[PDB]
Design a protein around this ligand. Structure first.
Ligand code: 8X6
Ligand code: MG
Length: 382
């Protein structure tokens, strides 16, 4: 029997693994039934937890639960991005020769890990999710990275794959993987200008690619760091901080424990809106023992975040300028990230593109892994 290769979207907050088998891509769910797995690792006196198990115990173990390794990978410790991010993380980041390492307690001792070691643990979990589905060990993979990652970040991501025991067939960028998922590199002769609009993940990104005889050229990349998934969560947090003020007469904004528990509920409620018109928030003993039970409607979420959705258009206009292309020169518009599922986000982009239709047939939370899986099958078939 021949071994299939997997495609891995190694995400900032969630990772996704796919495998192409017999003409179709299967996005593989993990052992908790989740088609995406938190890019989290936690350490205890006896265990190293990865994915859902690590994320689900973050509230009581914040110093030894690592996340956001993608924000450190391939960077120098003195990078002002690293220094600003360190102020928000509850886990320790140390400087070892101008390279960051995360330091935690694990098995009764202090241990430090390079970002590519934390990402290799996430990769090992993705590998195991695929091996449980396929029933044999998986070692060939295509791993994706953002188009704006430099050579240091791409090489460090490849190193995480090597540490996880994977043969990294290729490192491809996330917008290229999305275009491959839709087969936009297989439309025959003639160039195709593709715009990839990625909203909902760790960072909002707009990229423009030109595909010519199967060859991809990145013409432009634009975005907004304050349009990541966390900024949508924080908008929901501020809204519920005001609701708790009106209902219980207390201001919880300066209580770290209360704000963190509310942020976890908000992030899950936000995602729950993909399958339901209304998501319930049930937080026991949120602040001073007061239970906070509420809900968020899709209608409210859309109005609350209207300005954030509108803030995505200026980066699209800037990417079109950098690429030296008119809106009418774009053949395909591709949606990536959970927020692109919202018909109001789709309407904003469709109207901006003068009525052009958008590609949304592949679940935007899965499109990057879907494309990485297709590319992995193509390289393994070769
Ligand atoms: N950021 C993120 O992951 N999410 C944002 C909030 N969600 C919403 N989905 C909708 C929605 C979905 C399908 C049909 C109509 C409406 C409305 S608000 C889910 C995705
Ligand atoms: Mg992503």
């Amino acid at each position: 029997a021949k071994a299939a290769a997997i495609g891995i979207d190694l995400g900032t907050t969630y990772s996704c693994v796919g495998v192409f088998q017999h003409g179709k891509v299967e996005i593989i769910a993990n052992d908790q039934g989740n088609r995406t797995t938190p890019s989290y690792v936690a350490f205890t006196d006896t265990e190293r937890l990865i994915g859902d198990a690590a994320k689900n115990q973050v509230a009581l173990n914040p110093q030894n639960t690592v996340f956001d390794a993608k924000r450190l990978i391939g960077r120098k410790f003195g990078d002002p991005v690293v220094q600003s991010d360190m102020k928000h993380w509850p886990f320790q980041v140390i400087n070892d020769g101008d390279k960051p390492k995360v330091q935690v307690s694990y098995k009764g001792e202090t241990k430090a890990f390079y970002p590519e070691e934390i990402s290799s643990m996430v990769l090992t979990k993705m590998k195991e999710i695929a091996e449980a589905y396929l029933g044999y060990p998986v070692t060939n993979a295509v791993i994706t990275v953002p188009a704006y990652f430099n050579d240091s970040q791409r090489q460090a991501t490849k190193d995480a794959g090597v540490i996880a025991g994977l043969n990294v067939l290729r490192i491809i960028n996330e917008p290229t993987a999305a275009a491959i998922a839709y087969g936009l590199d297989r439309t025959g002769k003639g160039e195709r200008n593709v715009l990839i609009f990625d909203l909902g993940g760790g960072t909002f990104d707009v990229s423009i690619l030109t595909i010519d005889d199967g060859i991809f050229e990145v013409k432009a990349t634009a975005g907004d760091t304050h349009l990541g998934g966390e900024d949508f969560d924080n908008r929901l947090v501020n809204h519920f901080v005001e609701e708790f003020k009106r209902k219980h007469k207390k201001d919880i904004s300066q209580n770290k424990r209360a704000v963190r528990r509310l942020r976890t509920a908000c992030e899950r409620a936000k995602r729950t809106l993909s399958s339901s018109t209304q998501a319930s928030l049930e937080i026991d003993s949120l602040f001073e023992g007061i239970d906070f039970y509420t809900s968020i409607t899709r209608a409210r979420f859309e109005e609350l975040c209207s300005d954030l959705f509108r803030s995505t258009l200026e980066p699209v206009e800037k990417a079109l300028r950098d690429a030296k292309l008119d809106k009418a020169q774009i053949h395909d518009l591709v949606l990536v990230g959970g927020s692109t599922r919202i018909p109001k986000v789709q309407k904003l982009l469709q109207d901006f593109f003068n009525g052009r239709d958008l590609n949304k047939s592949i679940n935007p939370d899965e499109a990057v892994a879907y494309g990485a899986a297709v590319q992995a099958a193509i390289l393994i078939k070769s």
